[PDB]
Design a protein around this ligand. Structure first.
Ligand SMILES: CCCCCCCC/C=C\CCCCCCCC(=O)OC[C@H](COP(=O)(O)OCC[N+](C)(C)C)OC(=O)CCCCCCC/C=C\CCCCCCCC
Ligand SMILES: CCCCCCCC/C=C\CCCCCCCC(=O)OC[C@H](COP(=O)(O)OCC[N+](C)(C)C)OC(=O)CCCCCCC/C=C\CCCCCCCC
Ligand SMILES: CCCCCCCC/C=C\CCCCCCCC(=O)OC[C@H](COP(=O)(O)OCC[N+](C)(C)C)OC(=O)CCCCCCC/C=C\CCCCCCCC
Ligand SMILES: CCCCCCCC/C=C\CCCCCCCC(=O)OC[C@H](COP(=O)(O)OCC[N+](C)(C)C)OC(=O)CCCCCCC/C=C\CCCCCCCC
Ligand SMILES: CCCCCCCC/C=C\CCCCCCCC(=O)OC[C@H](COP(=O)(O)OCC[N+](C)(C)C)OC(=O)CCCCCCC/C=C\CCCCCCCC
Ligand SMILES: CCCCCCCC/C=C\CCCCCCCC(=O)OC[C@H](COP(=O)(O)OCC[N+](C)(C)C)OC(=O)CCCCCCC/C=C\CCCCCCCC
Ligand SMILES: CC(C)CCC[C@@H](C)[C@H]1CC[C@H]2[C@@H]3CC=C4C[C@@H](OC(=O)CCC(=O)O)CC[C@]4(C)[C@H]3CC[C@]12C
Ligand SMILES: CC(C)CCC[C@@H](C)[C@H]1CC[C@H]2[C@@H]3CC=C4C[C@@H](OC(=O)CCC(=O)O)CC[C@]4(C)[C@H]3CC[C@]12C
Ligand SMILES: CC(C)CCC[C@@H](C)[C@H]1CC[C@H]2[C@@H]3CC=C4C[C@@H](OC(=O)CCC(=O)O)CC[C@]4(C)[C@H]3CC[C@]12C
Ligand SMILES: CC(C)CCC[C@@H](C)[C@H]1CC[C@H]2[C@@H]3CC=C4C[C@@H](OC(=O)CCC(=O)O)CC[C@]4(C)[C@H]3CC[C@]12C
Ligand SMILES: CC(C)CCC[C@@H](C)[C@H]1CC[C@H]2[C@@H]3CC=C4C[C@@H](OC(=O)CCC(=O)O)CC[C@]4(C)[C@H]3CC[C@]12C
Ligand SMILES: CC(C)CCC[C@@H](C)[C@H]1CC[C@H]2[C@@H]3CC=C4C[C@@H](O)CC[C@]4(C)[C@H]3CC[C@]12C
Ligand SMILES: CC(C)CCC[C@@H](C)[C@H]1CC[C@H]2[C@@H]3CC=C4C[C@@H](O)CC[C@]4(C)[C@H]3CC[C@]12C
Ligand SMILES: [Ca+2]
Ligand SMILES: [Ca+2]
Ligand SMILES: [Ca+2]
Ligand SMILES: [Ca+2]
Ligand SMILES: [Ca+2]
Lengths: 644, 148, 612
């Protein structure tokens, strides 16, 4: 936060040093007459600095003064070199500024003066951060490729640029074009920059070299959500086999998409990244057909066998909690005889009958099942991460936690059974509601139940959590109000509020209207009570519980095409998980191999389709070569009013 | 051809694509022959030879995309649109493909209230859909503004 | 599923055989220089095959090489014949490929070489399936008519095509034009193909011959939902009588629409098909006025007389269940004296008083009414079907099942009364809630109650069924949790959870908030209970019951013009049912006959309107 305060003080100080210098001020406006008067002096300070460590040539290039800049190069040719020496704009030369301002004459004048085309603008104002508004790169070729100047890119290559210039992030030129906000003009430059490669043997062509994260330009478009760049890179990886009328048969290349992937493959990059714009690549031309062929064939049957093994596991655990051992109460009821009702307790040497030998089999099924959970899930938590990015995988989220907490509470019950501890009701009654509500994990493989389980999650971390802060405000105010009213009275004719922990649990239920409400009709209640309960029932039942339904109802139609995009991404996350953990004897590799068909060793997936025949489009571009309704039109005027 | 905005290049890119039915960047006389036969015409082999050779600056014999972009800027019809419409379209279009969709007029209408059914979203599309792909262009988007 | 895996292996193998053959590769690109070097040899394998059983001429036609194809015809004229011999593209000749690619010079070159214009592309890649992306037909005239080339259609007729070419489905050329995805250009070809008929006497003109399902081209547009082709075929079947200013009086022909129909007529085809695009033909120009004249005149009064007979039937059955015989308890209360409250039981020789002789009349009304249901409904289930397509008629759906299950449970009660079985409460208490909720069938003839009964059905098989899977997950988790908490305690001060069948029935009700909630306030409840019930009431009452109202409220405005189209189709299904089962003494035939007006023997319906 204080860095932006310090960065603003740098820019105001730079304007101070220009006004307080006769060279820098004259180089700022244009003052071509004033430079000849100063530079003819003896000690006219040609290597003068500023706040950004800039010279007079950096100023003349920044404020776009071609006439003043040539005068500085004539009187002092050493200023074409010597970049800025500040921390912020470190390494930025005068050639960098002329390229970003997209000047054509000043760049060509600097290249005649033997400028460095391989300098590095390695300051903190050019690095990829959310603080900086731009990420252009480090090299002059990277600057010219991002401001969309094809003249300067062609000019820089002819003067000996390097096409394989890598940053401090490792990004080449082709990686930087993907990270730009103008998708369409980045495609036009991407064809240009590969066109001037054409001799890049190197055992690495050009667009296959990765950055320091191991990502090619194809996979970096997959992570960053460039839908436009992704479709442009599909042109290289398809082959049209035959065109039979309105029917083509293309042949996509699954060598960087399919998750056979001993390396990190594209379906793992998209499904683990946090951006909500990368999940739109799951609807493109090779990826949508790849997931469906995995899910229909081998994804759904293996997911419904794990849904039936887990369901018979949690029935076997349930009947060990129903038939758990109990003996009648040993000593006495003599705990104070008006508030005790427990009459059985836990047994120590439970296994001494044949009916408990069946249960011992059922408990060893449970405990072995609780170890297997902590061996397939915990060595992914402590190994692939130190719990920094485990929370939201996609939005899938809690079912990692609910299956760890289940396997913990079974093993707590194992400890309390061996040492014969007292209360096993507490570790069990967590382990059942954690156990059965984890069956909701297996409702993502059914289209009926899929998008509904996402809306349960988007209410708990949202429109139910913001209601439970303003519920606990209310039922602390009224429960402490109802407590002091019945504090001075008789706690057996109306005992909803005799303890303060009980008064919090009555008012929590009167807010929810699940218990009835304090009324006796034989004895005179306090006169203050009927006032403060009629005040309570209006802002509990008439206002705030009818404001959840108005708020959950408003949300449910707004996120109603996002939860359908979230469900199609829960299938991809499930499919990649089932592909990784299962052995290779099951789950054959997707696509057709190419060894016995003369295509190499890579794996292909063909897709045929019937496209169209749209006459009005194709006839308009052909001549260019030559040698229900009523309320729809109401909606467009609603858009014209909104636009205006 | 450096006078062409972001939405026109996106229109002309797929316009290059449905000519080129082999998945590269080369219009041989074959693929323009496959188009002109599908228009019902009888393509003269001299006419197929002339139209490629007329606009092919490099001399390889196949029209690529910058030559198809150079030709289309010659044979551009016109557009004289507004600042307010173009800034509206670039915000409406989210992924930047040069096209507003049926999935992207749901977002604009949810932004200002306006409960549409998914049928009524497609009923908005077909009114602005001049040519037909189930998408509204930038040229079709301007058409649904200055009609009044 | 494995067929598409096998079909992809065929296409990759075809590209292998082309590259591994010097003839087929040279015929692929164009290589007109390379063909003259190979074909001048002695054994240059002119009848060479591939994966699809194709020749070099099939390859040159597929990749659109006019120059290479003529060289193959000059060096070997036998290749114009000899179609593909694979299973997938069986029978496809080289003329078929030149027509689908819409080549004009290659077709005319093949017709000079005496090509077969009556060949059949009878492979598994041309049949009408959801696997194939196209259904073009079998004949070259069928191929040219579907890719919209009027030049090649005129070219094929002049060289002796057959205008009545029928497929393996029986479809003619005019049937295939209806099944195409471009409706407007199919209308343009439909006029062209009839124009070249013009001599089709045959005792069958051209567009009256059916396919192997008995459907004409007019009725096939009705089934498949071609609204564009349906309005185009109405031009033949109307007659403008007079035009009086802004007022015309047309005269539609009800000879293939009206369900007098000893054959299968168009109102039965639309109302039984599964497509949701065929129900838009119920709003067109002769059909909308035909249904309303049936429903207003003879459809609604006969449906409200069956609604009043059934209502007095289910009152007569109700009072036989109220006045059913019971006697006081015979032996003892001695079943274990803390959990028994029943104090009457069923009588054996019930009919021995005059007040039960009235009921015996009322029960014979019921049982005879239960046989008549199983004689007008079961001989349509076992006869017209083996229960393959009984389920969703339109969406009407359950009322077939609820009236069979009612007539079954009455006859179970007849068996248990004759053999004097013990429990008649179980077959009756089904038969009443099945009996009275079937009165909701008769709410489709009232516009107030019509579209509301459809929304009850579209929630039960939808937004209530997906909630009851995630309700039974919750009330198995908490009911097994609440059971073990009160398992170690006293089951009379708070006995909501003493049995496991009772703990499932308490937590089902605490989820619905219909019973109150376990609270005693005299004895100390378990400390774990107040935690796990406050956890329960948040995700039962505050979350998930307020998420039905947010979900049923979201659905109700989305399907709010579909349920109005579903109601206008429930009237047509009711009208056709009432027309079929009632005799001809009632229900006069719709429209005006034409015997005494000089129009033939067919039946007409005039509609006048003011246009604009
Ligand atoms: C108990 C032990 C035995 C149970 C099942 C035996 C093995 C079942 C799996 C065999 C693989 C074959 C299969 O594919 O079987 C899964 C089916 C799929 O469903 P579908 O037929 O509608 O697919 C068609 C959907 N279409 C029509 C919309 C396109 O589903 C099913 O049988 C469901 C199988 C059980 C899954 C329960 C998992 C727990 C779910 C909790 C939800 C909360
Ligand atoms: C791969 C993971 C699974 C591995 C195998 C599964 C577990 C089998 C292995 C060992 C058994 C231990 C499980 C039970 C633990 C306690 C056993 C026990 O205590 O006895 C089991 C009881 C028999 O009763 P009892 O011996 O106490 O004597 C009669 C009692 N008296 C007199 C009151 C009637 O068995 C009963 O009650 C059965 C009644 C329960 C209701 C049906 C159970 C399942 C329900 C649906 C299955 C399919 C649904 C869709 C999926
Ligand atoms: C997910 C979103 C929601 C999550 C946030 C919800 C936060 C609220 C939830 C719980 C609040 C904790 C309250 C626990 C108080 C129980 C203390 C206890 O165990 O003893 C109870 C004692 C007296 O009870 P007694 O009958 O035994 O003595 C009778 C008096 N004699 C001895 C004279 C007869 O009363 C006392 O201590 C009274 C102490 C008063 C302090 C209550 C407020 C504490 C928390 C405030 C944070 C909330 C801010 C946002 C809302
Ligand atoms: C042996 C008994 C049968 C003899 C007489 C009983 C009445 C049935 C015949 C009387 C004519 C029925 C009729 O023509 O009209 C039925 C009226 C509704 O009046 P409307 O249709 O004429 O409206 C005016 C529409 N405009 C202006 C276009 C004409 O209502 C009615 O009597 C309906 C009669 C009872 C219907 C039972 C349905 C059970 C309810 C289910 C709800 C769930
Ligand atoms: C369309 C085909 C189906 C119907 C065909 C008609 C056949 C009818 C034959 C039997 C009906 C089944 C009833 C079975 C049990 C009857 C009760 C019983 O067996 O005992 C008779 C009691 C007491 O009779 P009592 O002591 O006065 O002496 C009788 C001397 N005697 C009759 C000369 C006045 O009478 C009573 O039914 C108790 C009074 C009932 C209370 C009102 C019930 C009706 C209310 C609404 C229905 C219409 C609403 C339309 C909208
Ligand atoms: C069309 C769409 C519908 C959507 C809903 C799906 C249908 C499923 C809904 C609810 C489940 C129904 C099954 C009911 C379970 C039968 C249990 C039963 O009635 O037997 C009674 C026994 C013991 O009774 P007790 O009190 O005499 O012994 C007390 C112990 N002593 C003697 C030591 C004192 O209890 C036992 O063994 C308990 C055995 C464990 C049962 C848990 C699993 C059962 C169901 C699994 C499928 C759920 C899939 C959801 C997706
Ligand atoms: C002892 C006998 C009866 C065998 C019992 C084995 C199964 C009942 C267990 C053992 C390991 C379990 C699996 C361990 C890990 C996972 C991953 C887990 O993944 C998530 O939670 C992803 C969603 C998220 O990001 O939260 C879902 C449950 C699952 C498949 C579990 C399903 C149930 C399994 C197969
Ligand atoms: C915004 C509110 C006013 C909505 C309008 C509803 C009124 C008709 C309700 C709300 C508040 C109620 C009052 C709240 C407090 C009291 C005091 C209450 O106390 C007594 O006089 C009897 C003593 C006792 O009840 O213990 C009697 C009911 C009464 C007048 C209630 C009568 C009905 C009132 C006016
Ligand atoms: C002694 C006397 C009173 C006998 C009783 C005769 C009537 C009360 C019964 C006999 C036949 C019954 C009919 C048999 C068949 C049908 C069709 C049935 O249609 C369906 O099942 C709905 C269609 C769909 O699923 O969409 C609705 C009830 C109805 C009219 C029944 C209404 C009640 C009827 C007229
Ligand atoms: C009908 C579907 C679509 C809704 C979801 C099913 C379950 C969530 C509900 C509905 C039917 C219910 C069952 C209907 C019948 C019974 C028998 C009945 O058990 C008893 O005999 C004990 C109670 C008694 O004896 O009074 C009550 C519990 C139970 C299992 C109910 C438990 C909760 C169930 C399974
Ligand atoms: C999601 C929640 C946190 C939103 C806000 C609601 C809270 C104010 C509720 C939810 C859980 C409730 C607690 C659940 C369990 C208990 C134990 C129970 O206390 C007893 O042990 C019995 C009373 C007695 O000591 O006599 C009742 C109070 C208390 C703390 C409840 C007090 C009110 C709490 C904190
Ligand atoms: C306190 C003890 C007794 C029980 C507490 C229950 C809580 C912790 C459990 C039980 C029910 C669970 C929820 C059930 C359903 C969903 C929707 C799913 O898409 C993500 C997980 C999520 C959001 C679960 C989160 C954790 C949850 C709220
Ligand atoms: C278990 C026993 C006692 C109860 C029987 C209830 C069942 C058989 C009955 C009671 C109410 C009935 C529903 C009532 C309403 C509708 C809407 C209608 O458009 C189609 C039928 C449908 C969907 C019925 C289906 C069957 C149904 C659910
Ligand atoms: Ca090409
Ligand atoms: Ca070129
Ligand atoms: Ca878009
Ligand atoms: Ca368009
Ligand atoms: Ca109540």
């Amino acid at each position: 936060e204080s860095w932006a305060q310090s960065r603003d003080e740098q820019n105001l100080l730079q304007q101070k040093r220009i006004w307080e210098s006769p060279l820098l001020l004259a180089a700022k406006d244009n003052d071509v007459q004033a430079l000849n008067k100063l530079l003819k002096y003896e000690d006219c300070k040609v290597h003068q600095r500023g706040a950004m460590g800039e010279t007079a040539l950096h100023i003349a290039a920044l404020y776009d003064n071609l006439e003043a800049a040539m005068v500085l190069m004539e009187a002092a040719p050493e200023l074409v070199f010597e970049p800025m020496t500040s921390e912020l704009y470190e390494g930025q030369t005068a050639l960098h500024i002329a390229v970003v301002n997209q000047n054509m004459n000043l760049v060509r004048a600097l290249l005649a003066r033997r400028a460095s085309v391989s300098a590095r603008a390695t300051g903190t104002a050019f690095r990829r951060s959310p603080c900086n508004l731009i990420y252009f790169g480090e090299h002059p070729l990277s600057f010219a490729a991002c401001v969309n100047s094809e003249e300067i890119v062609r000019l820089l290559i002819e003067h000996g640029a390097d096409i394989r210039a890598q940053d401090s992030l490792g990004n080449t030129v082709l990686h930087i074009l993907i990270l730009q906000p103008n998708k369409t003009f980045a495609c036009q430059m991407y064809n240009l920059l590969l066109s001037y490669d054409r001799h890049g043997d190197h055992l690495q062509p050009l667009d296959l070299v990765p950055n320091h994260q191991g990502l090619t330009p194809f996979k970096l478009a997959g992570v960053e959500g460039n839908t436009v760049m992704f479709q442009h890179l599909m042109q290289k990886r398809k082959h049209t086999q035959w065109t039979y009328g309105p029917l083509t048969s293309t042949l996509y290349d699954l060598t960087e998409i399919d998750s056979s992937g001993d390396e990190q493959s594209l379906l793992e990059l998209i499904i683990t990244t946090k951006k909500r714009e990368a999940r739109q690549i799951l609807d493109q031309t090779p990826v949508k057909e790849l997931v469906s062929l995995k899910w229909k064939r081998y994804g759904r049957p293996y997911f419904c066998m794990l849904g039936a093994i887990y369901l018979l596991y949690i029935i076997c655990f349930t009947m060990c909690c129903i038939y758990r051992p109990l003996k009648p109460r040993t000593n006495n009821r003599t705990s104070p005889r008006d508030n005790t009702l427990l009459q059985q307790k836990l047994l120590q040497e439970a296994y001494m009958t044949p009916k408990d030998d069946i249960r011992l089999v059922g408990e060893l099924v449970t405990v072995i099942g609780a170890i297997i959970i902590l061996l397939v899930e915990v060595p992914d938590i402590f190994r692939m991460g130190v719990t920094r990015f485990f929370g939201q995988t996609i939005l899938g989220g809690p079912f990692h936690v609910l299956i760890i907490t289940y396997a913990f509470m079974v093993l707590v019950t194992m400890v309390m059974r061996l040492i014969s501890a007292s209360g096993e009701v507490v570790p069990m009654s967590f382990a059942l509601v954690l156990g059965w509500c984890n069956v909701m994990y297996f409702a993502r493989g059914f289209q009926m139940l899929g998008p509904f389980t996402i809306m349960i999650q988007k209410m708990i971390f949202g429109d139910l959590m913001r209601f439970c802060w303003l519920m606990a405000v209310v039922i602390l105010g009224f429960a402490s109000a109802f407590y002091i009213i019945f504090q001075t009275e008789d706690p057996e004719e109306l005992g909803h509020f005799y303890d303060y922990p009980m008064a919090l649990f009555s008012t929590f239920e009167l807010f929810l209207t699940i218990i009835d409400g304090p009324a006796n009709y034989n004895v005179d209640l306090p006169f203050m009570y009927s006032i403060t309960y009629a005040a309570f029932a209006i802002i509990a039942t008439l206002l705030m519980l009818n404001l959840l339904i108005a708020m959950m109802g408003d949300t449910h139609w707004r996120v109603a095409h996002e939860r359908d995009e979230l469900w199609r991404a829960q299938i991809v996350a499930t499919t990649v998980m089932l592909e990784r953990k299962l052995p290779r004897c099951l789950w054959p590799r997707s696509g057709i191999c190419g060894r016995e068909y003369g295509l190499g060793d890579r794996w292909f997936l063909r897709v045929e389709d019937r496209q169209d025949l749209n006459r009005q489009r194709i006839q308009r571009y052909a001549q260019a070569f030559h040698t229900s309704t009523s309320r729809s039109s109401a909606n467009w005027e609603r858009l014209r009013q909104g636009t205006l | 051809a450096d006078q062409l905005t972001e939405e026109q290049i996106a229109e002309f890119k797929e316009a290059f694509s449905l000519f080129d039915k082999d998945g590269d960047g080369t219009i041989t006389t074959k693929e323009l022959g496959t188009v002109m036969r599908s228009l019902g015409q009888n393509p003269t082999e001299a006419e197929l030879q002339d139209m490629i050779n007329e606009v092919d600056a490099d001399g390889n014999g196949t029209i690529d995309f910058p030559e198809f972009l150079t030709m289309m800027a010659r044979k551009m019809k016109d557009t004289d649109s507004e600042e307010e419409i173009r800034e509206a379209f670039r915000v409406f279009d989210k992924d930047g493909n040069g096209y507003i969709s049926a999935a992207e007029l749901r977002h604009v209408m949810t932004n200002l209230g306006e409960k549409l059914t998914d049928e009524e979203v497609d009923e908005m599309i077909r009114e602005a859909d001049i040519d037909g792909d189930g998408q509204v262009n930038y040229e079709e988007f301007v058409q649904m503004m200055t009609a009044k």
